[PDB]
Amino acid sequence: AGALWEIEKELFTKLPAPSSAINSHLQPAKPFKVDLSTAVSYNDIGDINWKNLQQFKGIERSEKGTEGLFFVETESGVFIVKRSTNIESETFCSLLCMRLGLHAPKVRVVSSNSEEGTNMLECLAAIDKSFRVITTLANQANILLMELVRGITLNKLTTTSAPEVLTKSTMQQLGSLMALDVIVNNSDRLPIAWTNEGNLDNIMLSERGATVVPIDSKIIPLDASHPHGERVRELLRTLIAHPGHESSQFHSIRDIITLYTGYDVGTEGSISMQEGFLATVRECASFDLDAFERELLSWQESLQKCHNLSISPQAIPFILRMLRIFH
Ligand SMILES: Nc1ncnc2c1ncn2[C@@H]1O[C@H](COP(=O)(O)O)[C@@H](O)[C@H]1O
């Protein structure tokens, strides 16, 4: 919040507005409870009036994922209040995505011990009928505010829907997302440089032209001298040499998506993802690394300054190491 938020606004502003095409296949599931199927995303989480208790209709705890995710329904829309395992990574990552062109959900950090922090907590305590909000959030030093994203996670794609959703476009985006995860060593989402069975929960497809919107983005700097280094270089090399054919790695990741969705967007699809992945790498090579490092440091500064939130000291040099390899 504060400087950080401004920096976010700036980045967010630069993102290419997504399609104006609403894909009915991505519409959230119709179930105090919030009907995500018809709920509208609260417009500006930079401005939330915690003192106007009458604007609030209720709060629901998402029984999925972390556990600490709540949907707040005001009269102006719905936003999300969430407990985060690693808030610094998550938020810092959110920014990085937006910087790389990715449509992450707008996120804002609220310090528990601040005027707004206390105000918000008092508001939630007033509206919570579950008796679980305060006990889960009040404990935290910083709480996360998030933009409601209307869509569904990749896993939840049927097969009878996948065709109209997994267009060339979506695929390329997916490709890009992978590049990012590589840069930050995020093994959770889409494996490529990790034997993990991945996890498609961490990725949503917005109704807005099925645009890919990542979630629970995290960073884990495996620095100094590790396999990741050559591994990505290799993949890259092969990819560049003859991008006309589905590399071993993308074939693997293709399979995965093929599994959860039971839909094989064979070869043509894999190539698309490869394209997107490259497109991003290419972009990343053009980065004036001195400037970028500063951009990075600005975020870190803002993080530390607005909330005592220090991100790992190896984070930046790592993301930079990777970024250099794309050169
Ligand atoms: N911005 C968002 N909009 C809608 N659902 C979300 C959003 N962020 C996270 N979720 C979800 O809530 C579930 C659990 O979130 P998470 O604990 O962060 O994995 C996810 O599978 C999604 O349905």
Curated annotation (Swiss-Prot):
Superkingdom as given in the UniProt entry: Eukaryota
Q: Where does ATP bind?
A: 66, 82, 147, 149, 162-169, 216
Where does the protein end up?
Answer: Cytoplasm
Quaternary state and interactors: Monomer.
Q: What does the protein in this record do?
A: Has a role in the regulation of microfilament formation. Phosphorylates the actin-fragmin complex on threonine residues, in vitro.
What family does the entry list? Belongs to the protein kinase superfamily. AFK protein kinase family.
The name on file for this protein is Actin-fragmin kinase
